Every structure is written in structure tokens, then in C-alpha cells.
Design a binder for these strands. Structure first.
Ligand SMILES: Nc1nc2c(ncn2[C@@H]2O[C@H](COP(=O)(O)OP(=O)(O)NP(=O)(O)O)[C@@H](O)[C@H]2O)c(=O)[nH]1
Ligand SMILES: [Mg+2]
Ligand SMILES: [Mg+2]
Ligand SMILES: [Mg+2]
Ligand SMILES: [Mg+2]
Ligand SMILES: [Mg+2]
Ligand SMILES: [Mg+2]
Ligand SMILES: [Mg+2]
Ligand SMILES: [Mg+2]
Ligand SMILES: [Mg+2]
Ligand SMILES: [Mg+2]
Ligand SMILES: [Mg+2]
Ligand SMILES: [Mg+2]
Ligand SMILES: [Mg+2]
Length: 311
RNA sequence: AGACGAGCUACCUAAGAACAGCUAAAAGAGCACACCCGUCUAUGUAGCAAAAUAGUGGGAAGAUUUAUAGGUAGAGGCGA
RNA sequence: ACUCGGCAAAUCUUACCCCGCCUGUUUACCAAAAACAUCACCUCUAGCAUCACCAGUAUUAGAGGCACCGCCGCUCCACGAGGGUUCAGCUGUCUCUUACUUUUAACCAGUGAAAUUGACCUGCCCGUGAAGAGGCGGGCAUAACACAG
RNA sequence: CUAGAGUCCAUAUCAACAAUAGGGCGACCUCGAUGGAUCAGGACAUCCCGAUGGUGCAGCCGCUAUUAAAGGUUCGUUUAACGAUUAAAGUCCUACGUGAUCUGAGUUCAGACCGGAGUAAUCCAGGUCGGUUUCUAUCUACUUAAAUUCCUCCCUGUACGAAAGGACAAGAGAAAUAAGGCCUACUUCACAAAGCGCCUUCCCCCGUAAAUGAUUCUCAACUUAGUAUACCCACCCCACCCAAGAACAGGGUUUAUAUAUAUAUAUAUAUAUAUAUAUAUAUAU
């Protein structure tokens, strides 16, 4: 297939509105009433999508790494993954499944130990523990809070959860998630880096749904996700869409998808005789459905940081 | 404290009436008149009107709409 | 590309998220919804005649909570003048307004209101002042007079 | 002020501890109705254009200073960030400058939900959805000639520079904006109006640089440099027409545990009752 993805003329797709800048401002102010920091990140991109603006700005507190969405990620190289964070500077890495509440029960005992091996300073007399949840948008921060309440507090959903970026607009109030020990969680908006270090990282972030797909163009990551499937040699889309065989031509794949689902759109094409309205297969609809199917997990586990892991 | 009010409206009782056409199927079904309602915009703001007009909208065989007579009265009635 | 917003107008498009099962109902006159009712499910009380319950009798009746179905607190169809986003098209929304028609409009003839009104022979600049001056101080301007903005 | 940076070196620029000047918490008036659009007036403490000193100014770029407010100071995404540009995308005052010109939010309201507090009713400088002020103008005030900038070319690949590089001044072409007009074509359209179309657009700026020269560019006597015109102007009218016009005016008209198969047995325990010497026994759950 294609040895490498063409990145000529493409820039990173940043998304830093004011709703997260004001939210990021609150974290510096609200740092006084927190004990531990938990960073929730997607397991599909354990290394690339992390926001550097969470270390030198917040800092000063124990840091816990929680890797969500294990079902959508391939954990064959799991041991090599944690070895990388250990070299990178992270000691506590936990994989979790928020939609199923897997491995969530081990968060609380480790969080208590991390706070114990620390200095609460003015919060020494507080029996209550306050934990702040951080990460990029759409990684399951709100789902993590609800999962902890269901497992420990045995209560209902307390934070709104959606499949769209920017569900949690601002820093919510403290929400109890457990009784033994008595401890709350702070729901915070997802914060992206104002400047993405590499174009490939931006596409990876767009692949997992952390950023809006429309501002990047549904076609560019349809090919990119098709490119990654070919690299992994999974070919889960071949039998899902009833395609004849694995292909690399992005336009032809979307043509089959539009044919398969009977989606057609009429567009204006600039000809030498003027503008002509013709009906064509609905490529944006095909791209959106193809992207949604991968996100739902019907195309198998993926790992977007395999190349950076090997070197 | 003592009288007067359910001819508006909330609800109930008695016995009445209305719902073209098309698709469908024996549907608190769909499109869509009559009819009921009042989402949005504009006009109006001592106005036609102490809540209206134009366009655009929801419902429109049902927990539908509606005429007549009767009942529940203020420390109360009635209230999806 | 206007804009808080594709509001309006043109055109007669697709997809996604949040919330509410759907359906229906309400603040007559600033809220039609995520609010309420709602089938379904759960809790409590009652062993019984002659105006309600009821001319009924535990598979019944009354008082409530939740809001169908399904799974072991969570998903799923369908639907919504509900709140956000998007594809294509569409257009004076805009770049950037222009032209024409009708009504108001102005003049002529008739009829003829309302708020308002301490008295007025009712100018500008700077300063002053119960601290924001047509009316006070120092300068300047200054025949009278109606109509349309 | 001259410690200290700037290889040396206070004063090309930066700057310590200090000092001297200037700028816009109180309850004094009113408790008898903020953002953007449009239009902008003004200050200079000048973002761009201009003139002139210094430079760690070779030339191009730069830094700093003096003078100058006539002219100009973009379009987009989200709710300041960066996207592309520009000679530049200035700091402010003007009751948010301006809501009897208009229009998002907030100060908040009648409905509701989530998180939190409260026995409750009900609340929250947490988040979210929805959500009505109107006006006929009386008075004051007002309601029709001088242009700027960018780019390209020539000078010139010249001066300067070892090269890398790369200008001034004068002149020419083209473009944009702004002001004032127009309909021959294009276009919206048709006896016409209009732009997307076309035409015209003209003065200086005084910071300093220097001669001579006394008690040396001179708050000494003195010399030099940069130290306006155009437009408008005469005075039948009934009626009709008009490129003139609101009217008027204007122009045109040639229970727990163990065992046996939920039951049974055993032990231990607790509850209750009785009897006997707090203790012991019996019965049952
Ligand atoms: N398949 C799968 N889906 C998951 C998992 N965890 C979360 N999701 C889903 O992914 C979506 C994103 O979760 P969410 O908690 O809303 O993320 P968020 O951090 O709150 N996003 P934001 O910062 O914008 O508020 C939700 O629809 C959630 O159900 C997982 O492990 N697997
Ligand atoms: Mg969230
Ligand atoms: Mg019919
Ligand atoms: Mg029906
Ligand atoms: Mg509405
Ligand atoms: Mg826009
Ligand atoms: Mg509309
Ligand atoms: Mg309805
Ligand atoms: Mg109402
Ligand atoms: Mg409800
Ligand atoms: Mg008259
Ligand atoms: Mg100056
Ligand atoms: Mg005003
Ligand atoms: Mg003009």
C-alpha cells in the first residue's frame, strides 16, 4: 500500500475556544482545594494526544494516569506501553473501561496511597479527600465520575455524558463518588493543547473524536483511518461493507459505502460550460458513517501510537 | 361578619352534533380541508383589538372539537 | 463572507449529540419545555351494602412514587414547532445596494382626538454652582417670520 | 541622581535604592418612569505618512530622540486566542460617546432541570433551557471649491559593501481608497434612475542645518536654507410644460458451626419462665 501519509501543505487542527481558556484559568485558582490529580486519556493514543499544558501549570500534586476506552484499543503491546510512560516520567498508569466499569475499583485504594505519600499542607485536618479529573475532551472524565458513584456510592448519574466534544462546559462543583473513604470528584472541561506539536497528532485526536470532524473535513481522516487499518492489516471494513477486497483508494471505498447504504447527494460541479447540478454518491455521508462505525468499535481494536512506540 | 356570582373559565352530569379527499390499515397511523390550537417573524403599541392582522406553523377518528340544560362558592371550589 | 443564531427570504437536503418513550396537557394576556399527565412497574391501606366509592367485592377499590419495552444502575426502536452541530443546495442575509408597484407620505376640501403644559421675551464657548446651566460670571453671536426633515 | 548592565565605556540603548513633578474609599445630586450596528466630535502621551538630531548609523534593515494630528489606521473562526493581509492594523476622552436611531448579553423576575444546603417551606457571586416597555417632536441645536497612499520601472544592480547583499533625490507607469460628477458603451434596466460601469481631483509647514559677528548660527545687532485662486453675480408670469420641485421656489413658452439425606441430629449461644444453693437445673424459640 502507501508507505507514508502525505502531509504536504497540511497544518494542525487546533481548537481552543474561550470556554476552555476560562476553564483552564479556573484550575490555577481552584488548585488550593484539591488533594490529587487524575488524568483521563484515551488508550488508543496513550502517548500522542496528551496535553503538555497540564504539568508545568497545574503540577505540585500527585499525578495519576487513567487510560480509558480499552475496548477500542489494542492491548497486545500493553507491557511496552507502560515501559514508555515509566521512561517518560509517569509511574501510576491504569487502564480502564468506563462504559463497563472495569478496573475502576482499583482507583480508590491507589489514590489514597498517593495522597498518603504526600503533604496536604493546609488540608491536613480535612478528613475529606478532593480529587480533580483532567484530560482532553471526550475521554470519559464525566463517565469516570459516574462510574465511581455507581461502583462505590451506588447512586445515579450525576454528570452529563455525551458522545460530542465539549459536553462539560465549565468546572462543575464537587460530586461525591464514594463513602469509604469520604471523597469527592471535580468534573472539569476537556482541555486541548493550544498548539499541537505534529500534524499526525491532530489527525489522531480527530480520529478518537476529541475534536470536531467538520473543521478538519470528513474526507481526510476517512483516508487516514483507512490508512491505519491497512497498516494494521485488520481489514475489518471489507466484510462489514461487503467489499470485494481490501483497497487503498479512498474515493472508491466511499463509493462502495455510499452504494452499500444507498446514499446520494446532488452537487454543483464547475464545468467549462458553466455550473451543472448532478447527483453523486454521498461521500460526506459515507465518510461520517465509516468514521462512526470505527468509533463504535465494529471495525476492531486499533492502536494509533504503534509507530511512535517502536521508534 | 352577612349577602351575590361556574351565561367567562377549571372540572363533572344528562341527552345531542361535526370531522372533504388521498395512502393505508380494522393504527391515541401518515399527507392534507373544515375546525381547534398559537412555534417564529413582521405589522400593530390610546391599535381593528384592555392580546389583534398577515405569513409561516402543531393537531386534525380522537385523552378530538362543539351547541343546550344542570352541579361543585371563598376558612371554599376546581386543578394531566 | 451577514448574524448571538441560515432570523427572514429563497430552496424543498443529509447526518450526529443532549433531553424527554411515544400520544396528549399548562402558566387565557412576556415561558408550549427538559415541566405535567401517560400505558408498564413498584409501595401503602381496606373483608364490605340501600345517595360518593358502588347498585362494585383482593384479578376489587382508594392513596401515592416512578415513567413504556429489555438487561444486571444501564441501553434500545419510533416520535418531538425542545436545546446544540453538520453535508449539499438555496437565495439581496451579506460584499453593496439599485430599480419599480401599493400604503402611510406632502398639498387641496370636510369632520376632527390624546399624552403633555409653573410662568417664558426659550442662542454658543469657557468658568462657577445641590458637584452635568437657554436663565449665574467673563467673552461671542444676534431684523422679524412660516413649511418640510 | 550615576550604583550597576552594555567586551572597554554612566549617559548608542537598559537600569537599582531613592527624590521631584503631571494625568484621572467617600455618599455630595437622582428612589413621584454592557457588547455590536450607524454616525462620529476632540486630545497627543504619534500605529502608519512627513521633516530633523544621535547611534554599538558601511549600505539595506533597526534602536532612541525632537517636531508634526492635514490624511489614513483590513477582512474572517470560536467565545482574548490564530487565519490570512496591510505603509499601519495607535493609546484614550466624549453620561456603554451615541438604545424618544436600532439591536446580542449581564444587573433578575414570574416556569423548569442537574449538583449543593436546608426537617420543611425554600435558597446558591455553580451550570442549563425559555422568557413584553411605549411614544404623533413643544423648544434649543442642526439639515450642499486645494487627495492621500501602495506597487512596478528608470536612476541602478548605481553609491555603499571584500562578498553576502543593496539605497537615495528627480522622473515615468499602474492600482486602491476618499471627495466631486456622469450615462457613450457593460450591467440592473429602458423617453429615465443606478453601479458592478466611466471621468476629474491643484498649497506650505519651520524640528534643525549653516555664514558674518560683539559682550561663537544671534531670547546680540544680522544673512541663507522650504524658516492663493476658482465658483457664485441682470430682475412678463394668468395658464401650460420641465432634465426644477414635498409646498413654496426655479427654468422654458418665438442464630452460628459440624454431620446424615430444604429436612433431621448434635454442640454452642441469646430470649422467656419456673425451681433450688450472684450460681445451678428444666422447658420452648
Ligand atoms: N465504547 C466505549 N465508550 C466509552 C467508554 N468510556 C466512555 N465511553 C463513551 O464515550 C463518550 C464520551 O464520554 P464522556 O464521559 O462524555 O467524556 P467527557 O470527558 O465527559 N467529554 P467532555 O470533556 O467534552 O465533557 C460517551 O458517550 C461515553 O459513553 C469506553 O470505555 N468504551
Ligand atoms: Mg464531560
Ligand atoms: Mg377524513
Ligand atoms: Mg393520527
Ligand atoms: Mg420558543
Ligand atoms: Mg460568520
Ligand atoms: Mg426560517
Ligand atoms: Mg405533541
Ligand atoms: Mg402566557
Ligand atoms: Mg415527568
Ligand atoms: Mg385638511
Ligand atoms: Mg508630540
Ligand atoms: Mg438617547
Ligand atoms: Mg459617487
Amino acid at each position: 500500500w502507501r508507505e507514508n501519509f502525505p502531509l504536504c501543505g497540511r497544518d494542525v487542527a487546533r481548537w481552543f475556544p474561550g470556554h476552555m481558556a476560562k476553564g483552564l484559568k479556573k484550575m490555577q485558582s481552584s488548585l488550593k482545594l484539591v488533594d490529587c490529580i487524575i488524568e483521563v486519556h484515551d488508550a488508543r493514543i496513550p502517548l500522542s494526544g496528551r496535553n503538555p499544558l497540564f504539568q508545568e501549570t497545574l503540577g505540585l500534586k500527585p499525578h495519576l494516569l487513567v487510560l480509558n476506552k480499552m475496548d477500542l484499543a489494542d492491548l497486545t503491546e500493553q507491557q511496552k506501553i507502560m515501559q514508555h510512560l515509566e521512561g517518560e516520567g509517569l509511574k501510576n498508569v491504569i487502564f480502564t473501561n468506563c462504559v463497563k466499569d472495569e478496573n475502576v475499583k482499583q482507583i480508590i485504594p491507589m489514590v489514597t496511597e498517593l495522597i498518603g505519600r504526600s503533604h496536604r499542607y493546609h488540608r491536613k485536618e480535612n478528613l475529606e479527600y478532593c480529587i480533580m479529573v483532567i484530560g482532553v475532551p471526550n475521554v470519559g472524565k464525566s463517565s469516570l465520575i459516574n462510574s465511581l458513584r455507581r461502583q462505590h456510592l451506588r447512586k445515579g448519574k450525576a454528570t452529563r455524558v455525551g458522545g460530542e466534544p465539549g459536553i462539560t462546559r465549565a468546572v462543575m462543583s464537587k460530586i461525591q463518588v464514594s463513602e469509604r473513604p469520604l471523597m469527592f470528584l471535580l468534573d472539569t472541561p476537556g482541555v486541548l493543547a493550544p498548539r499541537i506539536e505534529s500534524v499526525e497528532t491532530g489527525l489522531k485526536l480527530a480520529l478518537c473524536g476529541t475534536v470536531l470532524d467538520h473543521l478538519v473535513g470528513e474526507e481526510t481522516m476517512a483516508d487516514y483511518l483507512l490508512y491505519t487499518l491497512n497498516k494494521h492489516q485488520r481489514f475489518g471494513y471489507v466484510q462489514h461493507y461487503g467489499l470485494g477486497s481490501a483497497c487503498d483508494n479512498v474515493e472508491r471505498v466511499l463509493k462502495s459505502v455510499a452504494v452499500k447504504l444507498g446514499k446520494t447527494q446532488k452537487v454543483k460541479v464547475l464545468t467549462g460550460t458553466g455550473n451543472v447540478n448532478i447527483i453523486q454518491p454521498n461521500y460526506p455521508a459515507a465518510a461520517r458513517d465509516f468514521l462512526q462505525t470505527f468509533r463504535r468499535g465494529l471495525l476492531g481494536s486499533v492502536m494509533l501510537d504503534l509507530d511512535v512506540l517502536r521508534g
